[PDB]
Amino acid sequence: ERPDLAWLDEVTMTQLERNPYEVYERLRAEAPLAFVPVLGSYVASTAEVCREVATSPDFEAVITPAGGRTFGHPAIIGVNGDIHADLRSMVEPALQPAEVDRWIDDLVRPIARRYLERFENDGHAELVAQYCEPVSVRSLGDLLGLQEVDSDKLREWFAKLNRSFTNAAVDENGEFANPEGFAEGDQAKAEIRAVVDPLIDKWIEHPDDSAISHWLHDGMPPGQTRDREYIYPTIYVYLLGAMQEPGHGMASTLVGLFSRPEQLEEVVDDPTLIPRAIAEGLRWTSPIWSAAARISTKPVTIAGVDLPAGTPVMLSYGSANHDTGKYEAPSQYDLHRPPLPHLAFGAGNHACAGIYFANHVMRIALEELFEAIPNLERDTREGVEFWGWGFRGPTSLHVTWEV
Numbered sequence: 370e371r372p373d374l375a376w377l378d379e380v381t382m383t384q385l386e387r388n389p390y391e392v393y394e395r396l397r398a399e400a401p402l403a404f405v406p407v408l409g410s411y412v413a414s415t416a417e418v419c420r421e422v423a424t425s426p427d428f429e430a431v432i433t434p435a436g437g438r439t440f441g442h443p444a445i446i447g448v449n450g451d452i453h454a455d456l457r458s459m460v461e462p463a464l465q466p467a468e469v470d471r472w473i474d475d476l477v478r479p480i481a482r483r484y485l486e487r488f489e490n491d492g493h494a495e496l497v498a499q500y501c502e503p504v505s506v507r508s509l510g511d512l513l514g515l516q517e518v519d520s521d522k523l524r525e526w527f528a529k530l531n532r533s534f535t536n537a538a539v540d541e542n543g544e545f546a547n548p549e550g551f552a553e554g555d556q557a558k559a560e561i562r563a564v565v566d567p568l569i570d571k572w573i574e575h576p577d578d579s580a581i582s583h584w585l586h587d588g589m590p591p592g593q594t595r596d597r598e599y600i601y602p603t604i605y606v607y608l609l610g611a612m613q614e615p616g617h618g619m620a621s622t623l624v625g626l627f628s629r630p631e632q633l634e635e636v637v638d639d640p641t642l643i644p645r646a647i648a649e650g651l652r653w654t655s656p657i658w659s660a661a662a663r664i665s666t667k668p669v670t671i672a673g674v675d676l677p678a679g680t681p682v683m684l685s686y687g688s689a690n691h692d693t694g695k696y697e698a699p700s701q702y703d704l705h706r707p708p709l710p711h712l713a714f715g716a717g718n719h720a721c722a723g724i725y726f727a728n729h730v731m732r733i734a735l736e737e738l739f740e741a742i743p744n745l746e747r748d749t750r751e752g753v754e755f756w757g758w759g760f761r762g763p764t765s766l767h768v769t770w771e772v
């Protein structure tokens with residue numbers, strides 16, 4: 370243990386889930402690469418260290434221990450080499466920018482209107498449960514071929530997978546402190562299998578243009594499909610983060626705009642500013658805050674720390690996006706800060722494959738919301754609480770408007 374960081378011994382998992390920003394402010398100043406005992410891992414907290422680890426040839430992909438316990442093998446986020454190349458080739462077709470531009474409007478905009486019509490005349494709403502999450506999961510769910518899985522169920526699944534994936538607390542001996550916390554991830558996977566296995570059975574014989582059907586068939590010899598055990602971990606990758614994060618990003622962007630009322634008004638009046646508003650929202654509260662990791666493949670020295678080969682490092686991109694070496698007053702949402710790079714989509718060979726898709730989902734959702742409710746106001750009686758260390762976002766977003 371590093372002597373001057375003895376205070377890290379007293380950092381708790383609950384503290385990191387409720388608000389990691391004070392601890393990580395200390396880490397960025399004291400130890401940009403630091404071993405955090407309750408996480409049982411080195412953690413990268415600055416922009417320079419996160420970007421170096423994510424792009425270095427001396428590191429490769431790995432899943433965090435609780436993430437591996439949740440997803441198994443071969444999750445696209447945790448593999449390398451030929452397997453990673455295959456899984457990337459598998460997911461990339463529907464995510465290509467030219468392809469997304471062909472159909473993204475006809476996918477998301479009707480979905481956004483459907484959810485808006487349920488509440489736009491009420492004068493009040495809780496936008497996370499009633500809008501941001503449903504639009505995010507319904508859009509991706511239809512793309513995948515899960516049209517018949519209700520948005521309520523998709524939302525329950527990503528919540529359970531979230532809690533299992535981020536069940537990272539370890540004890541003195543490095544063993545998981547809360548092994549019972551993986552049970553609901555196991556239950557979610559069992560439910561997912563019961564729903565998706567019959568769909569896969571069908572797609573093997575009758576391919577259609579759902580993404581999962583293409584995952585089974587694309588690039589395969591005639592009459593062959595990828596085995597379902599080979600693609601299920603990447604299905605889980607989607608059913609957690611791909612389902613959850615566009616909703617998180619929408620909602621954090623909204624919370625940030627409400628915190629700057631003049632900027633909210635600017636964006637409602639000029640919706641061409643919505644992409645910039647979203648980019649700042651992702652930097653301000655990164656949806657995938659500290660879920661990603663890498664592992665060294667050779668001895669390497671990072672931020673003054675000599676690491677052996679085989680050392681995992683958690684990439685706390687949500688902290689890197691508050692690096693005061695790069696941003697002025699990063700805890701404040703500011704639509705007007707200059708367009709600078711950010712790490713909310715990761716970096717390197719394993720950077721987010723769905724960036725272009727995700728940005729359009731969030732853009733269209735906010736466009737439709739502001740057109741339907743231009744006089745949106747935050748219910749200042751009800752507070753906005755953010756939760757999560759691995760994945761972070763607001764747990765609710767109560768709003769009102771004069772009808």
Ligand code: HEM
Pocket residue numbers: 423445446447457460509607610611612614615618651655656657661662686712713714715716717718719720721722723724726727
């Ligand atoms: C605002 C929404 C999203 C954010 C902030 C986000 C962020 C991220 C981050 C931080 C990673 C890990 C990058 C790294 O390890 O360096 C990642 C990986 C990934 N994301 Fe996104 N994501 C979002 C939405 C989506 C969506 C909607 C999809 C699919 C339609 C998607 C597909 C993927 C895939 C396939 C990977 C694994 C890439 C690989 O390991 O090769 N993401 N994402």
Ligand SMILES: COc1cc(C=O)ccc1O
Pocket residue numbers: 446605606607608609610611657660661662
């Ligand atoms: C794109 O979805 C995911 C991304 C990550 C990145 O670390 C972890 C779990 C996920 O489900």
